[PDB]
Symmetry: D2
Subunit: 465 residues, 4 copies
Amino acid sequence: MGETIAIVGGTLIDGNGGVPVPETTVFIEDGRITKVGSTDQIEVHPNIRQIDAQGKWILPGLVNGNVHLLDGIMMMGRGGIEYLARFEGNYYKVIEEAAQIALRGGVTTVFDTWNALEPVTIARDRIASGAAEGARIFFAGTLIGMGGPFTGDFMRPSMQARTVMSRTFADRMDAMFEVGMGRHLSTLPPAEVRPLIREYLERGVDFCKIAVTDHLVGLLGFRAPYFTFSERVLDVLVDEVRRAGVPLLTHTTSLEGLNTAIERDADLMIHATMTGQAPIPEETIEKLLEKQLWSEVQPTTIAQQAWMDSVDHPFADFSGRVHHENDVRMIKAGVPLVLGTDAGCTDPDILEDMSQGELHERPWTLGEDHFVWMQAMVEKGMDPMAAILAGTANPAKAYRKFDELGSIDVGKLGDVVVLDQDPLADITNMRTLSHVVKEGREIDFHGLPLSPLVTAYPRTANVLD
Amino acid sequence: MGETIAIVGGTLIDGNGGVPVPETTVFIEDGRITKVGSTDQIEVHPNIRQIDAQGKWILPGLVNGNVHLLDGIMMMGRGGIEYLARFEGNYYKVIEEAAQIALRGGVTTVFDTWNALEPVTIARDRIASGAAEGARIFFAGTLIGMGGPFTGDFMRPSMQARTVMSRTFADRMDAMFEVGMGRHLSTLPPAEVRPLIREYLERGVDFCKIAVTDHLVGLLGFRAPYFTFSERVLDVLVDEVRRAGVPLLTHTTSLEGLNTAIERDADLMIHATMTGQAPIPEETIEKLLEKQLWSEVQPTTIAQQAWMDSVDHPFADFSGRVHHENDVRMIKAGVPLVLGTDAGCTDPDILEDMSQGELHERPWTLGEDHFVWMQAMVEKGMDPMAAILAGTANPAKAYRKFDELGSIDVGKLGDVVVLDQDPLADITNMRTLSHVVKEGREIDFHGLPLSPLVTAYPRTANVLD
Amino acid sequence: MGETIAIVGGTLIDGNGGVPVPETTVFIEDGRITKVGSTDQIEVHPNIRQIDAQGKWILPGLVNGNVHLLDGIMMMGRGGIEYLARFEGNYYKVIEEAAQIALRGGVTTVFDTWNALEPVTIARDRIASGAAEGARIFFAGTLIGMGGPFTGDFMRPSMQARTVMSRTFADRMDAMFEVGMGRHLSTLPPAEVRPLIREYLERGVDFCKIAVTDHLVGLLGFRAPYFTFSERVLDVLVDEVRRAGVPLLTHTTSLEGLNTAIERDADLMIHATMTGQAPIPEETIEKLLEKQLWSEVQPTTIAQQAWMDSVDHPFADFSGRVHHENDVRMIKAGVPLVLGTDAGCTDPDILEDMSQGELHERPWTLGEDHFVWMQAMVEKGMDPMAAILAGTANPAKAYRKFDELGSIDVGKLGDVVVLDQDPLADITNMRTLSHVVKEGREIDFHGLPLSPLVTAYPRTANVLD
Amino acid sequence: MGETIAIVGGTLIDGNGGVPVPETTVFIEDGRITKVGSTDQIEVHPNIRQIDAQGKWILPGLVNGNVHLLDGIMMMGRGGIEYLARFEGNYYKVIEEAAQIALRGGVTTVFDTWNALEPVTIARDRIASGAAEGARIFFAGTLIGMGGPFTGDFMRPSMQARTVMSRTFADRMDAMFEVGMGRHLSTLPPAEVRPLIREYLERGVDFCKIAVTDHLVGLLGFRAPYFTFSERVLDVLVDEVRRAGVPLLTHTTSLEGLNTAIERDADLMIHATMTGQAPIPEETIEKLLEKQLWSEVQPTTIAQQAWMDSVDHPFADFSGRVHHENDVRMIKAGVPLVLGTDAGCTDPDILEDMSQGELHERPWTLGEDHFVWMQAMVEKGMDPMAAILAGTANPAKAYRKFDELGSIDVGKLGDVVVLDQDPLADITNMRTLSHVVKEGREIDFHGLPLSPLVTAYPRTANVLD
Ligand SMILES: [Co+2]
Ligand SMILES: [Co+2]
Ligand SMILES: [Co+2]
Ligand SMILES: [Co+2]
Ligand SMILES: [Co+2]
Ligand SMILES: [Co+2]
């Protein structure tokens, strides 16, 4: 799948954190970066495709450490039934479309931390083999110990999908997301858990995410967290994940969940600063610093948060108040940080419901969510370069892919983006994409997605042959 | 549109109620009945297709006075969202499939008293023109003064679809069912109602059904009925319907509603015997007998009603108790009765939820509903011949189509069915279809529907190209 | 129960609409007004109690044409169960306390248009006989054709009390409000309705209120009104009310309901300008003018309405937008208008839930609601004198009590209030009460209610003997 | 506090499990047992009150290891609001009434494992001091880590009290049950949990019950259990409980919860056999046998469980199926068992809702619950003597009160009951009480409760002075 190209004469930001290098040239052959250096210092035979990066900035291909290519954030409110019913038969194409939408924003690698295993496998495999366009996918499959989209984990007091849908359909959806690893694992002794997780890991996942704490925030609010498992069952899960040799992700929503994750040396802790609206103790930050563990955080911009607060939004507490303070203090301490957003490609019927306030700097809008993330983190005092490293090298490191991707270095995959303006002068300039390259192949990124499916709109009631 | 055929040597039950005529032959040319006579009295040039009816019974094509080809009854519980979301783009084909399923049951003409106008129009016109297969369709479009499937008229206290769906989708679905004739009509002065119903009737409906009473039984139960309109607004609606020259249907759920419908000389009174679990007064029945108005009734069988009562079903009061007694008394009195069922082709995911008891002699299962109706009515004392007429000639008379269909008479359309066993001996023998003929064309009815859509099952999550 | 007193030397506003008379004296003997005229012109032997009305204004005792002394507005949202459970055993005392709270605001006569018959009878009879303090009560008992507080008439989609209370208690409350005249009347033929309403009227009510339209606004919103009865059953009810010789009240929520009420010559039409957010036609206003019928209207102040609109309040449409326009146009046409508010004495636990915006110029706060009403109507262009007549003579006339009360005239009951400042200069000066007299007895109105019950607060968990 | 009496000539079942000792006499002085011996071996100076026990059986005062004197089980369905609103002001008297109803059933000591702290304190102290009648009370106060009756811990998907009640009342009720030890504890670091539980234990509780697992079965069913706290927070709680010198109780709803409780050497494990409908592993039972820890279990009888299954009751899985099998296996293994029921004195309006089947051998009906427990356990194979010990000596042992009560031994409190029939011959004969003695004082137990409060019925709407 690799091709050959040269990105010529731009200011290079290679993702290793150093001072940027002007008039630099990147040379990619057969997918891989072979030469990085000064323009005058190396030659481009004109049988070779070139991009003119003069006056422009060269960055590695962007990396999102947490997306849902079947839109999971939606399923936690309105729209789950209609979306899943509408696209049954085509989930892998929904996933490919979402990957393409991510690619349209410069993101060449996505890490999907919750999805239905079958279609995300199909889509990853098709994208890897050139059979389909889109960002490179690595996935967890399901979240261990969490129920599917029609269980309590996606209910609200006034929103209970199972009251208005067939049990059969609901069960069929819950099964394709749970894959046998749902809430019932909490009823089992450790020796019955071990084989189930061992078998699950043999199914081909790139990493494993465990629900250390509950996923009941839609039902109970933010200040009543639980643990999904006893700690010895949790340790069973963790040990089997280590046996399988894949990275360990955690889902936590309390201070004690966070500490518990830290003491398991999690490779990546998803929304680590979501802590039941209780402030993270200095001790916990000191552990993150001593152990050099990666925390993913999911912030809101000043504007989005203010809008949320202005309408008493139900998820105003997800990133607001004490969690905002957590983000600020984590930044100021210099802990290892990873970009992730829970973003997905939201159904247009649900988008059409939304006010302009809801849409402006919306954190879950796949394709723009990473721009917004970097903006929000910089609004909280993060250094623009660190913010770029967060969306580039850091997730590669956390997921153990930094030998293949995440920085522009010889031997690594030729994923690259070119920006018209300086992202270190203004982080919103990350939006100023003009070229996108994946494995040395330049992408017509403005013409993505190739075959609109979810994003096809408006919708015709009776399509005539 | 029409073809030529002859049905030979069967006992004729012609639909006019007379003594059955043995060793009879029916001859059809270009869609029209040209000869009815004794067998040995008419030659069949044997280049002409023949059906050997010896030892068999010949009936007119069956007629159902009330169906919903988009399954409305379903939308009054679980399944509306998934069903409408899954088949958006294809509603007319859902309707054609249901029409074919009706045809598979011996029904050559269906009267649809609530549906979405655009797709039922498309389907009717394509079936009429030969572009699609199915029973002949006549329709009301919407019910004047009723809300769409995501309004109060389909809610239950613990079933509120709008709480878990996008407003945009809900609104789009309510608009294609309401077509501007929803609950808001109840807020208008008469002079502003007039143009809306005038314009509605210009959209090509075959008849018009008015909500004399409410449709809130799902929300409030059976003992709290309302009137939808004032008397003078009702005067406006009725006047405009009569001026458009189409039959007037009514929806009534109370004794006063029924009386109000009788006083307007309604052409057909849908579930006339549903009257708030209050018994129909003798004077009302005597009004029905004197004005000779058609009542559609929707009974349950003994087994079904008993299952319903056993599991304390929400709609046990639809046809149970006082409504059963109403049915019995209407039968004994000999009022004019019409077969109708509110049946539709139910989504297989919803059917798969059902127990054997729910499914057995289920009244809303399109394709078997009319058999079950006749069984149920004969269980209550109806004369089998009367029941057969209720499902052939009587609907045609009520809808003013008896000049074209509903009996086997010279000049009428050549819609015919053949049974292997005597329906007058045992009404369940209506199920023993061996031949079905529509407008002279014999139908391969065991092979319907042609292109399973709703009824395609099981459903595949990811269909590979 | 009458006593003797003289109100000396104040500017008299007698309620007949004329220019106010300065230096006037009102002389009451044994409950009745015996002399009204110039101060110099008549003598007060000093064995006689006097109030010094110098520099002050003399008005008749205030009259509220619509209250609920068991707080009905509350039962339509949160708090019904706890209130009714807390005060079972003492409803007549709740009612007396509320009457006393009305008296504290200058209101000497209240008309209660929905309540539980037994306790409102007990309280009226006790207040009339001196056994208990409070405003004079006249009542309807229940609203004919409406369900009790635990039926659909007080439900909202997210508020269903019967899901969390005993059926037994709920039924017991529904019975004491319905008194057999609930929703089931809609299921009956006219000849079965007649005796039930005839019997109900023999139970001792002062007037009868009929639910011409539905009471489902909490469940369905404002733009889906129904009629409770067929018009001939409605006419049965109306005729029996005329037979009984008591005033006819109507509840309407649509233009057609309003017209229907008008064509029955209703003595008082409660919230007549509540019309499904459709504008009242000129023709309907012309009928009100030609027939000189009384309309009660329930407006909001500019401030309260703005607050409601600022928080998307669920009952923002009760008096806002088109209904505001209705009020304005009714005022500008000069139709006969009556003050009423649906106000009650709200449980303090429910008041404690409320923001300051909700409480400021709240229309349903018994004891201040009439001040607010007059303010709101004057904000809409009503003449202050007409606004005073609306809360004084007009309800007396509508309910046919103007021969006994509602104006200061010889022969009438000696109900009087004294104000410190001029209500014709600023209508909020209606708040400046300094004396209150009922049947010639001066009231220590600042010390009401005598025996706090509902208003007793805070509430002690364990009261020790 | 104590009195003097003698019980003469009965078959003694003393609570220590030995062979029953015929023609025995028990002698009590100033509340204390001083003599147990053969009849003809001890003289009764006949100025001393006597109970003729000839032909009768003498048992220790019965003991219930788990009740709720404010009826908690009720609050998990319908009735919480009405019950708490109706009796605010009088909670301690509700508690005393329930204690008296326990006493009416032969129960002289009750252990209340969830209640509101203030009123249960008041009631315990007044019963202890002679100021009120009833069983001796020992209490936990609240359940550490559980929400109050208007939190998620008492919700069902279609039962959300807070949707129809004032926030103020709900909050006030949640505060008096939680006492600051609610769900928010799960958000805290260990060092901030420590002072709260330290201070909680200083408020005078007799023991402390910890929510090891969740209390969301009403909301999520039985197969989705969680842990309330991390291991180290649980360490803090347990450490502080042990340091306060009171018994440690646990609430567990999973196998891992049960194992976690066993590993902490809990003094009593409440509904130990409720384990997510997953069978208890043999190794857990063997742990119980080796550590000899007390398990409270809450079974259903055959009839009751069968009624429950017949009507598909929400709590059929509380004691049915795998939990029944757990009970059976625990009985066969001979683990230490304690009688407890979660029973309370249920509001008569709620009882009046119930069918005969619901009421028959109902496990939560205080005053009969312990009889039903013993019946249910003997139905599962328990030895009647063992069952009797489960309801006398065993709770006293688990709560560390066996030095004072639970057997008839010299030095212990003179709590005694007399039966007319042999409970070892048929366990239902535990119902044949003829005498009840508390601390030497014979109780007029047929005359309890003294002052019906909750149980006063029917309820009068308007009580005239
Ligand atoms: Co060269
Ligand atoms: Co912007
Ligand atoms: Co059958
Ligand atoms: Co004199
Ligand atoms: Co003010
Ligand atoms: Co029994």
